[PDB]
Each structure stands twice: as C-alpha cells, then as structure tokens.
Design a protein around this ligand. Sequence first.
Ligand SMILES: COc1ccc2c(c1)CCN(C(=O)Cc1cc(=O)[nH]o1)[C@H]2C(=O)Nc1ccc(C(C)(C)C)c(F)c1
Length: 215
Amino acid sequence: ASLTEIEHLVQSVCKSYRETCQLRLEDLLRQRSNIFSREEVTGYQRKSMWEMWERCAHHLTEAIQYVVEFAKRLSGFMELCQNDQIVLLKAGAMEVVLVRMCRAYNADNRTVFFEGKYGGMELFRALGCSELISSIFDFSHSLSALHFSEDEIALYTALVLINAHRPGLQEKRKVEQLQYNLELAFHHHLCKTHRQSILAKLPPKGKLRSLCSQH
Ligand SMILES: COc1ccc2c(c1)CCN(C(=O)Cc1cc(=O)[nH]o1)[C@H]2C(=O)Nc1ccc(C(C)(C)C)c(F)c1
C-alpha cells in the first residue's frame, strides 16, 4: 500500500464507475436544455400514483442493477463472503443511486432527468409524497453546489458501499481493511486534484439513510 499501489486503486475504481454509470455525463449535461412542456407535465400529473410508482421503481431498480455491477468490479468485494456482500449492498445501493442522481440534476432550473427530458418536482405530484421528493431535490441541489467530478462520485460511492459499521457482518476486519484502502485512495486523489475542500462540505453518513424512512 504505497504510491503506485494506491494510484492503481484510484484508477481501478474510476474505470469501474466509468463502465457502470448507466447515463453518460456528456449526455445529461447536453440534455439540460430539453425541459418537459407544461402539457407533458400535466400529462404526467394526471397519471395514477400506481403508474408513477411502477415507472419510478422500474428505473430505480434498473439503477440498482448498475450499482451492483460497480460493486462487483471493486477489487476485494468478491473476496468477501456471501453474507457480507449482500449486507453491504442492502444497506448501500439506494444511498449510491441517490448520490449518482445528482449528475442528472440541473441546479439552475431545479429540474431532474426523468424518462427522456428534464422536469421539476411538480412532475411527481401523482405520488403524493411531496415531503420526500423535496428532500431528494434538496440533497441533489447541495451535491450540485460542489460540482462533483465523475472520479469523485466513483470514489465517494465506493466508500458509501464499503462500510465496516454495517450491522450483521461476519468478517468485519475484511471489510475494515477494504474500507481503509478506499479512504486512502479517496483522500490521495482529492489531494492530487486540489479538491480537499469538499470533505468538509459532504453530507454526514447518517443523513443519507434518514431519507430512506417511508421507503
Ligand atoms: C444516474 O442515476 C440515474 C438518474 C436518473 C435516472 C436514472 C438513473 C435511471 C434512468 N432514468 C429514467 O428516467 C429512464 C430513462 C433512461 C433513459 O435513457 N431515459 O430515460 C432516470 C430516472 O429514473 N430519474 C428519476 C428522477 C427522480 C426520481 C424521484 C421520484 C426519486 C425524484 C426518480 F424515481 C427517477
């Protein structure tokens, strides 16, 4: 665990994310101008809550599938025992999706990428969960303020998954050793990119799963 050793891991995780990001940043950023029309928004609003759940759950599960593939090609993750792998994914994958979602959020007009175009939070009125949606938009807004780089998401979301303090882990030391190397990679990269400032500005680790309440 020296200089090139850790830099191998940085590049290792950044490749792993690049290959499992589902939606390209270049796509999301260009698509920002393509906003839903008032007709289309009403169109979405008239739908049943059930059709909105179905649509939403589809894409979100699909997202979780991509997060698993990211987890699978993190070195060390496969060496963990069956039980420990699933514990980490059960407590992490939704938190990872939530972070990854900030790339799909235009902070200028307060809109999100959903089914082809960008819409505001009034788009999901059918769900009747305005409280939860606001907080999701809030959380995305603050992470947009930091201008999160692709590599930074890659590294941070690796650290979201690989947590030694998850309840019900058999080989805690095996996870510990893994979490530690990823912290080193994360901290080394921020140092290397003059981006240490963001550490202090990241949401606390009990704020991610405070949103997963009526979930
Ligand atoms: C990087 O993480 C993301 C970000 C957005 C989306 C996804 C994954 C999955 C595909 N998707 C789609 O809309 C489906 C589709 C794919 C494509 O090429 N074109 O369209 C988006 C998405 O699901 N957005 C959405 C935004 C708010 C919500 C909340 C209701 C939680 C606010 C939500 F459930 C989903």
